[PDB]
Amino acid sequence: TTDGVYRVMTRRLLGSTQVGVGVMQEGVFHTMWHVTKGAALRSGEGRLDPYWGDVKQDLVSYCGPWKLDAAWDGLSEVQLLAVPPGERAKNIQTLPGIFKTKDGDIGAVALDYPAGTSGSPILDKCGRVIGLYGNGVVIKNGSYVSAITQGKR
Amino acid sequence: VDMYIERAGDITWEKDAEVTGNSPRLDVALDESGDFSLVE
């Protein structure tokens, strides 16, 4: 339950499936709303209950309010710390593009990983989490582009 | 449905990491359910 990146798993009567990823920071677990839909999370022996969420931002926090507040500088390369199902964590560096919306520009990464990678953290060069991966769009040729989704602290 | 978490690593930047992906500039809309879509 210490700081770090975690897989979000589900199991019924047989094996387990990875449905997402999240970040533990300052005693709060951060992931994307579509990963858990607000369901409680087991962490070893304990139960983590959702504390805050927002379906439109596609974010959820457990144990306390959203803690991640680093922002993409709009200029520099970033790293996705991808935690794909069945694979160990790995870093991919990229220069974001931009989702241009009526309410402003959002950094966006043209990186394509399985659905259960949703919630993987995107990092600045200091290792701070500037957002989570996995809410995005496909373009005409089918390629996937994810927003750099960050909440408010 | 037992949903549970398991630690997967430390959060750090990797020096000399592999670089991939383009930098698309896309016009998009965000609906109230959290879905992004391309503006036609």
């Binding site: 994307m32 659905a115 809410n135 995005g136 769009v137 996937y144 | -």
Partner: peptide, 6 residues
């Protein structure tokens, strides 16, 4: 996206 958005 393995799916088209998430």
């Amino acid at each position: 996206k393995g799916x088209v958005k998430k």
